[PDB]
Amino acid sequence: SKFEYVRDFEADDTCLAHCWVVVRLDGRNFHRFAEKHNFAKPNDSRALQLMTKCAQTVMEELEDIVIAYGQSDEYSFVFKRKTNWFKRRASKFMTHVASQFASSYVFYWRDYFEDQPLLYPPGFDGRVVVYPSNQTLKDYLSWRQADCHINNLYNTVFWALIQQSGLTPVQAQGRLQGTLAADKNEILFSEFNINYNNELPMYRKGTVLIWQKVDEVTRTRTKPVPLHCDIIGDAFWKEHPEILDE
Amino acid sequence: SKFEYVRDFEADDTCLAHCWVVVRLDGRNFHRFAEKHNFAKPNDSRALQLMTKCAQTVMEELEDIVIAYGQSDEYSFVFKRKTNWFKRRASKFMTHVASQFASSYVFYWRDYFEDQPLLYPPGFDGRVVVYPSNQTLKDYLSWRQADCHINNLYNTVFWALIQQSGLTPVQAQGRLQGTLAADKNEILFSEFNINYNNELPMYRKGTVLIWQKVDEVMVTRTRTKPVPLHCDIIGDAFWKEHPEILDE
Amino acid sequence: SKFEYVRDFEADDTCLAHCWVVVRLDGRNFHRFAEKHNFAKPNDSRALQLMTKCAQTVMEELEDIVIAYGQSDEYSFVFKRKTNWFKRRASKFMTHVASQFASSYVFYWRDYFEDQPLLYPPGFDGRVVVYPSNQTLKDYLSWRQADCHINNLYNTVFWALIQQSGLTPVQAQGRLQGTLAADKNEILFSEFNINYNNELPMYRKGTVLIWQKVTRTKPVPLHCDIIGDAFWKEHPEILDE
Amino acid sequence: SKFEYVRDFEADDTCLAHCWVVVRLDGRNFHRFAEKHNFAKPNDSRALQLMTKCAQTVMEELEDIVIAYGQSDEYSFVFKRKTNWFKRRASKFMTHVASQFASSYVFYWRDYFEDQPLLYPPGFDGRVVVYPSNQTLKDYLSWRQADCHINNLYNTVFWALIQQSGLTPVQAQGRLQGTLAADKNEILFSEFNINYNNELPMYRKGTVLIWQKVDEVMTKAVTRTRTKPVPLHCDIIGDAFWKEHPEILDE
Secondary structure, eight states: OOSGGGGGGOOOOBOOTTSEEEEEEEEETHHHHHHHTTOOSSOOHHHHHHHHHHHHHHHHHSSOEEEEEEETTEEEEEEOTTOOGGGGBHHHHHHHHHHHHHHHHHHHHHHHOSSSOOOSOOEEEOOEEEESSHHHHHHHHHHHHHHHHHHHHHHHHHHHHHHTTOOOHHHHHHHHTTOOHHHHHHHHHHHTOOOGGGSOHHHHHOEEEEEEEEOOOOOOEEEEEEEOOOSSSHHHHHHOGGGTOO | OOSGGGGGGOOOOBOOTTSEEEEEEEETTHHHHHHHTTOOSSOOHHHHHHHHHHHHHHHHHSSOEEEEEEETTEEEEEEOTTOOGGGGBHHHHHHHHHHHHHHHHHHHHHHHOSSOOOOSOOOEEOOEEEEOSHHHHHHHHHHHHHHHHHHHHHHHHHHHHHHSSOOOHHHHHHHHTTOOHHHHHHHHHHHSOOOGGGSOHHHHSOEEEEEEEEEEOOOOEEEEEEEEEOOOOSSHHHHHHOGGGTOO | OOOGGGGGGOOOOBOOTTOEEEEEEEETTHHHHHHHTTOOSSOOHHHHHHHHHHHHHHHHHSSOEEEEEEETTEEEEEEOTTOOGGGGBHHHHHHHHHHHHHHHHHHHHHHHOSSSOOOSOOOEEOOEEEESSHHHHHHHHHHHHHHHHHHHHHHHHHHHHHHSSOOOHHHHHHHHTTOOHHHHHHHHHHHTOOOGGGSOHHHHSOEEEEEEEOOOEEEEEEOOOSSSHHHHHHOTTTTOO | OOSGGGGGGOOOOBOOTTOEEEEEEEETTHHHHHHHTTOOSSOOHHHHHHHHHHHHHHHHHSSOEEEEEEETTEEEEEEOTTOOGGGGBHHHHHHHHHHHHHHHHHHHHHHHOSSSOOOSOOOEEOOEEEESSHHHHHHHHHHHHHHHHHHHHHHHHHHHHHHTTOOOHHHHHHHHTTOOHHHHHHHHHHHTOOOGGGSOHHHHSOEEEEEEEEEEEEOOOEEEEEEEEEEEOOOSSSHHHHHHOGGGTOO
16 A cells, blocks of 8 residues: 555544434525526425435435425434444435535436426535434424524515515514514505415424335335425324334 | 524635645446446447536636546546636535536436437435645546556456456456566557557547637637647646646 | 644544543553552451542542442542532543542552551552433442452452462462352352351442532442442432432 | 443544644732732732742653643643653643642742741643744743733832832823833832842743752762753743753744
8 A cells, every 4th residue: 555544534423322313404505596587476386395305315315314405495304313324424324415515405406397498507516513411312302393483584684575565674673673473474464465474384393204114006116205294292192203213 | 684693504614725725526336337338348438428528517617727637437626726617616626516416417418429318317425625726636637547457458458358348357467466567568569459558548548628728700709718638738748738727 | 922723633532422431440450559569358448448438538639429338459439420620520520539649649658558558559440430310320339349349259269279278379260250149159168167247348349439518518338239220219319310 | 231322422622733732820819829828019029939939840740741831820831742641632731730839839838938828729720822833832932921010010010109118009001091101110210219130030030940960969978960940030032041941942
């Protein structure tokens, strides 16, 4: 050899054993991306479904992914805490997730965007977080869902004030400053006759991805099915105890 | 809020300041990929050029990448040592490189494989390495190029024994066991009349990527772009020819 | 300034939040230390108690230490998992523990070694371990106590063959190779009339240090078993806090 | 076994190869320590010399320490960059340095503080820093020496305004607010007739510790020359010092 010594400079990044590993992907410069490709405001079904398809491909090509959660230009994957995949090297986790997701995006672009053409290949960033207890993982997922709900409740009335009322962005943002949750709900209900609760459950709750038994003559295989329910309340977790307790 | 405290569990991964950062991408299970898509043995020009184009896209979309080096199903990118991009968070470096490369691969698949169809989206893995001195970075690049040369010198005669001689893989591997460099060179030169030195410089030396000044008219308009090369990077001549890459 | 930028090269070492931190001190080259100072075989009460006194000083001068466990030439301190001391920088933990222990050793040497003179200042090494659950911390403590018991059971009969039987170390180690627990117990009971079970509780169980009320609270020592659930059911405040 | 698996939770602390390792010890709450033991202001020779002796003991009991630098209640040790001691585990470095220093302090307390009694055992904290080039290590040592010089130049005139002038600390600090280097030097030279250059070289330059060859003669008339960590009080910011001792960096 006489050159292998450089490999000694590789630092270790093994994650603490018996701990949940979480990888969060976030699109890079996706505001400009949605701008160049005429994304629908405040929500675009094509983008959300394509993100879910990429997340399913990621869950299928890798292992030990027990749950995924997605929202506009973001996704999170939770690997099981007792995993031994890649000796718990966070670098492998995040690079595999990012590369697989980014390739699947360009691959399945056409399936969901029949009319729109992809102008350029997008970029993504990732990160790894280690959580020692089940409570902290539950709280992280609840944090993501609450962020989803708040952003959707703001953007719905913001684009209702820009599109159906003809206000510049500065005008709408000055109109919404200082409003509470029920305040925005009432602005919607009384100024546009739009009930926020009637909005699609995929816009105000995000997407969850869990293994379930499908059939397709007969194809009794497991696949990552999506859901659009609340993951902050104990009901979801008491209804699926095997995901956490294993 | 009531939930943001979970963000405290994010550990720091800042790379040592004043140090070369190197990110190496490597295709995952790429043997099966080259199998399913009828890759040419021992080398396929189309695949190598597609990897080089993805690497150029990576060098253009990101910053402070001063050099890249490529080989069969792998690439390495060297960020300048005094960089401050993303506060030197290795996570950002590697995820950005991996994602950009993997998306550019699927995008530009058609440009080089006009007939061949992509069956599935490929996966890639990455890693970060910190090198404190110019000598260590030079030695890492020399290691990659020497590995390239040895693998190509082996695979050339290995596939020459299977294709042009009709030997099963076990037979070719048993015939090549114990051979040296000159041994394989002589087997090739005397049993197949193939001179290894005349082989394409992109197969036995890899690919290097450096910023150079390109002229493009339609006037003599000019701009900088990442050009490829296939020269030796182990000898000081290459570095004496481009001093701006290390001393900046 | 023009020089402060070097401070950027300090790496971060924050321990994972909501996790038990454990610092284990172990004396360096303490074989030669016990050799030059004529330590009692197989155990010396003065030395073990001095280690306990240093550990108490460490528990009092620092914070969030809920328990300590000690044995021949080693000690361990468990900081509470929800601590925020020094922003959970492991470096501060280990350097403070090591320095305080090493200073207290030389300080309180005379109290326990009135006749003996300290020949040189000893050295110590440390380390930090992060445990995510109570079960792993319990298992670590049980590991330490089992190591204590096995080492004491071996050394008792090992020095009994050297002192009361006149055998060289090689002879005793060749005689003890392959013996089980009941094997050593029977060799002791039948060759020296020494019952291992009757041995002092500080030699075959180690030492535990926990806060208790005398009127203010102070770290009292104990010599009971910490592997059995009874110990933890007797002290619920240390685990659930 | 059945319990050793917990050892898997031990994290690694390997230092970057081919890099200078630096351990800096700093006394904990040493303001209160110097207060309770009646330390001399602005500088106390006993404390500084005892710290230097502890640092020498640390340099002798451990290995691969090529240089040490000391200042008020602080010290720094530079291990050789190509070291392999303890497989470059920073924890071992820092814990060994801290424990040895803290024990040597209490041990040799009496040798330098014969009259003063040690009230309690002091505590110390440390840290590890990895430097990739010789320039960064040189700059770190120069940073420490410049900090020493600035603190001593400030404290000299500060305690001259408190002790020989009768000013409260808040008043003296408000009087010193906004003063430059030449300002403090001129206040000292013209209001107290103290020339800063005449001050002891150990106060305005710190302390350096380097291996040098010591000669020594024993009983029975035989002379033996062995290596020992000698102290110095010279400038380490100027290139002259490094040109005079090239073996410390180039090895």
